[PDB]
Each structure stands twice: as structure tokens, then as C-alpha cells.
Amino acid sequence: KQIFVLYFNIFLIFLGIGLVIPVLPVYLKDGSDLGLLVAAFALSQMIISPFGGTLADKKLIICIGLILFSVSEFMFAVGHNFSVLMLSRVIGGMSAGMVMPGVTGLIADISPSHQKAKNFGYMSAIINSGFILGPGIGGFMAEVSHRMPFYFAGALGILAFIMSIVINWKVFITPVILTLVLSFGLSAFETLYSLYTADKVNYSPKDISIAITGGGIFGALFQIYFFDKFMKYFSELTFIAWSLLYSVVVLILLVFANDYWSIMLISFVVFIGFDMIRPAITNYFSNIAGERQGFAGGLNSTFTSMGNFIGPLIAGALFDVHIEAPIYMAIGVSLAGVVIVLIEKQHRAAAADLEDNW
Template sequence: MKKPLKEQKTVLLILLSNIFIIFLGVGLIIPVMPSFMNIMHLSGQTMGYLVAAFAFAQLLMSPLAGRWIDCYGRKKMIIIGLFIFSVSELIFGIGTHVSVLYLSRVLGGISSAFIMPAVTAFVADITSVEERPKAMGYISAAISIGFIIGPGIGGFIAELGVRAPFYFAAGFALITCISSLFILTEPLTKQQLLETTQLKKDTNFVSDLKRSFHPLYIIAFIIVFVLAFGLSAYETVFSLYSDHKFGFTPRDIATIITISAIFGVVVQVFMFGKMVDKLGEKKLIQICLIAGVVLAVASTMISSYLAILLITCFIFLAFDLLRPALTTYLSKTAEKEQGFIAGMNSTYTSLGNIVGPALGGILFDVNINYPYLFAAVILFIGLVITMMWKEKQSASSLAK
């Protein structure tokens, strides 16, 4: 019998801290991008590649990490990932050449491949099916605080120095690593780990990737990709867009992102579970995609600080609700293979995070409005796919 979430507050807090620190690291670079561009004389394209390097390393490692999570346990992967992440942030802080920054982002991506699916699988293991949407909402809130408040925190800490945010992240990651070592208890028994290891003896990355194309998973994974692509393309150029078009300072950018994040987190924590109960995962996903398309286009038509703040609040909210809806759906289909599902989820997220920032940077150099418009097109394609998904679901229901 699994304990209610309210009886596992300490474990849940540690797990949420782990996922938060990873996405904090992803977002920290955003507000200092203009400063790094000026100091190192880098182009928007190079900065896009720098963000994408993190996701590329995560992509390569995620399938293998998913297998290790199922075979060797969630706790080990979390601890190893946090230690690597701490080292990566320290390297970024002391780096003075762009090649060192790339090395740091690669190590960060590897650590994320361990931590993100391990935490998701851990939470799925300790929660009942009834409480899982709420738990996934908490995870998404932690991701939002890290990925969206990350730039905000980075902007404020950058007042102490452009490299200060990375030293902060390195120290925080080391603290959560030590806390996880002493507080977390592996949710799977040795027997369960052994059974999973035997089950996966005849599988490999190629077979796992083929399995992700199963009708039960593939549409959801495509939407995972679309979400990651749209959000990363939008956020990667947000600070550059605000700096070049409106002359916003890092503090202005940090304020907008921080307020948006707080708004999104409050809605996720207190309303996500109720929204899933009322609308269901699929309908909620479609509503969020529609909002994303409209708001991404609207972002190119506004100029006042208040308008930018409002648009940013609601587009981030749409992304924040879309993520846990997808994760909840996938975790319900995973059964005993939470590591596989979480690993593939991470893989498709990484694909989006690679292509999004890279194309966003290239398009920014051509026209500063193009990244937002392109993100809108990608989100619209995702919406069309969900409509097709709905038709197939209905057709299968009629066949019964």
C-alpha cells in the first residue's frame, strides 16, 4: 500500500528540489546571454547552439539513463546526476573561452538525463494512480520555477557578477546531492531491480526507440517534442528580443519572468488536478496549444512593458499546464517501465530543446520576430496532430 503524498512530504520536497536545480541551470544562462555576447563577441546563432548543446548531450544519454534507472535504481542515478551537474555549473562559472562553456553545457545535459527521468520514475513509484496527477503537477511546478524563474534568479544574482549565478547553482546542486544521499530510500526492492534487468537484457537503444513509436505512446511523445521546441525557441530569444527591441535591462527581464513563473506555479499547484479531472489530459493539451499559438503571434505585435508582462504570463502558463498533462498520461501507460517512459520523455524533450534554440538563434539573426512566429507554426502543427489523435481514439472506440 503506497503512502499518501501528505505522509511523504520530506521525500517529495527533496525530489522536487532535485528537478528544480536542473531546470534552474537550464534557465540561468538566459538573462546573461547579452552580457556573454558582448564579452566574447558571439552571435545569436552561437548562443542558440550553446543552449542546444545541453539538450544534445541529454538526448544522447537519455535512452541509456532510462535503462540504468530501471536496472540500477532511481536513487543512484539521482545522486550521480546531481554531482555531475554541480561540476558542470562550476566549470561554466570559471570558463573564459566558448569551448569551456560548451563542455559545461554538455556535462549539464548528461546530468539532466540522469535526474529528470529518475525523479519522474521515483514519484510514479511512490504515488497511487489517483494522486499521480497532483504529484506530476508538483513536478511541473518545480520545473517551471527552475526553467522560468531560473532566468529571473540569474538576472538578480548577476548583479553580483555575470558568473555569480553559476557558482550559486553549483553550491545548491551539491547540497541537494548530499541531502538525497542521506534522505532518499530506493523505492524498488533488489528483486524488482533484478527482474527489470532480466527483462531488458534483449533490448537496446534502437529497440527502445522503436517501442516509442507504438500508437499508445507516439502522439504524446510528438507533443512532448513540440512543447520543448516551442518553449525553448521562445525563451531562448526572449532576453535577446527584449534587449534589442525594447532596451530592457537584465533586471527588467528578470522581473517579467519571475512574475510569470509565480503566476504559473500558483495555477499548477492549486488548479492543475481539478482541470485534469474536469477536462481530461487530451482536451487540456489542446487548449494549451491553441493559447500558445495565439500568444506567440501576439508577442510580435506588442510594445508596452505591461503588455509584454501579460503575454509572457499566459504563454508560460500554457506551457506549464501542457507539460504535466503529457507526463501524467505517459506515466499511466508505463506500468512497470517508468524508467523507459521517463527516459523516452527526456529524449523527445531533448530533441525539441536542441532544434528550438538552434533555429531560434539563426532566425533571430535574420529577423527578431521570426523565432516567435516559427514557434507559433510548430505549436499549430502540434495542435493539428492532437486533432488527428482524437479522431483515431474515437474511431477505435466505435470499432469496439
């Protein structure tokens, strides 16, 4: 019971990131502006991640972050000016950066024995599922009212508050870039996808929402089942490389797909690669520094937030330049991740053979 509330809390916190994706066209009333709000959320989270951890060193921080998230969501619901939306996004990012440290601290202590190694993988899966389903749930809730999703998210924030009431940096260079790859490959893509599908083949908010929700659900189920079943076939690095290659294949063939049902079916299966990448990256981080737990989680969080900042910002500009440019951006970032994985494999093999020769 006391663990499920934390999972729902972090799910809601990361859902608040993408809840603005399908509705901001209505709120704007006149690319970069669309990505600016999610960038503000991510930037505030990244700034107050180390500060949030320092505060957590001094819990009530989770409750205060939940209250701040609720009030931020409510002012976004009642917001009408660009400044108000900017401030609401900033407080939402502060809430995220004050709630995530508390959840990370409490989940490690709550999980007994060796269960925390898989608990953190499940937490990463929850992060990815919430981040992906954000736009889908937002589009579904916007059907009754375009202002509705923020009232609904604020309400769930109050309910979450009530329920909660009731070293060497040489190695970390590899996973961190990978953390900066996935968050770059995913967020930017998911920031543009809607608009892309609204311009290339003229989707509808209902169709966009059902496509995103189906992709997220299929990706999450495939993730859990065949991630339990798939770590035996390959290793962590080979699995990451293959997932990046699969994501590249899916994105490339999505670029050359114009039919309605083809686009829908590929969107149902486009989120498998990232959903399998994220827990693998978390396991890589855990293996890299077992003793330095929490610090590795801190780097994971700050660089995930940095990726969520960087992705949409240039994704909007590239979209303003070319309609499918963010797709090429994501493909290039995933190819760079593949190259980095190969380089790290070469370095690992060289070190291993050197040690064996010694």
C-alpha cells in the same frame, strides 16, 4: 522530507538549463552561439538518457550526478574560453541525464498506492517551473555580479549533494510529438524572448528578469490551482488543444504589442498555456501505457530533451534572420500541435464508433 530533496534536485537540474539565458551576452564577447550551449546541455541529456537508465539498472548515481553538476557549474563560473564553456555544458547535460533517471525511479517507489499519478504531474509542473524560472533567477542573480549565478548554482549543487547524502509504439506516436511540440514551443521562445525584448522595445536585465519571474510564478500558481479545477471541464486532448490555442493567441497578440507595460503584462500571462500543457502531456503518457511505466517516462524524458535541443538551435538562426521569427516558429509549432490533436481526436472517434458498431 526525503521527497522534497528530490524535487529540489530536479528543480535545480532543470534550472541549470536556462540559468545561462540572460548572462551569455556578457560571457560571449564575440544568435546561434547563444543557443549552442543550451543545445549542448540538451543533446548530452538526450544521448545519456537511455545510457543513464541502463546505468541506473546497475542510488549513488544521483550523488555522482550532483557532484558532476556542481563541478560543471563551477568551471562554467570560472570559464573564459569557448571550449571550456562547451565542455561545462556537456558535463551539465551528463549530470542531468544521470540524475533524472534516479529521481524518476525513486519517486515512483516512494509514492504509495495511487498517489504516483499526481506525483508525476507535480514533478512535470516542477520541471516546467524550474525551466521557466531559470532565466528569471539568473537575471536576478546577475545584478550583483554577472559571474555570480554560476557560483550560486554550484553552491546549491553542493548543498543538494549533502542533502541527498542525508509493446506497440503506434499509440506513443501521438504524445511524443506533443512532447516534441511543447518543448519546441517553449524553449525556443524562452531562448529568444530576452534578446527579442532587448531589441524590439529595449528592455533591461532587471526588467527582463522580473517579467520572466512574474510570468513563471503566475503560470505555476494558475497551473496548480486551475489544473486541479480544470480537468473536470474538458478531457485531456481538448484541454491540450485549448491550451495550445490560448498560447497561440497570447503569442500572436505579443507580436503586435510594443508598449512597455503591455509587453510586461502579457509576459506575466504568456506561460499559462505551456504550464497547463506539460502535466496534461504527462497524464496522457501515463494513460497510454500504465503497465509500461518508466519506459513511457523514458520516452518523455528523451523527447523533452530532444525538443530542448531542437528549439534553441533554429531559434537562434531565425532570430539572426528576423527579430520576432522565433515567435512565429512557436506559433506554427503550437498550430501543428492543435492539428495533430484534432487528427488524433478524429482517429479516436472513428475507432470508438467502429467498436460500438461491432
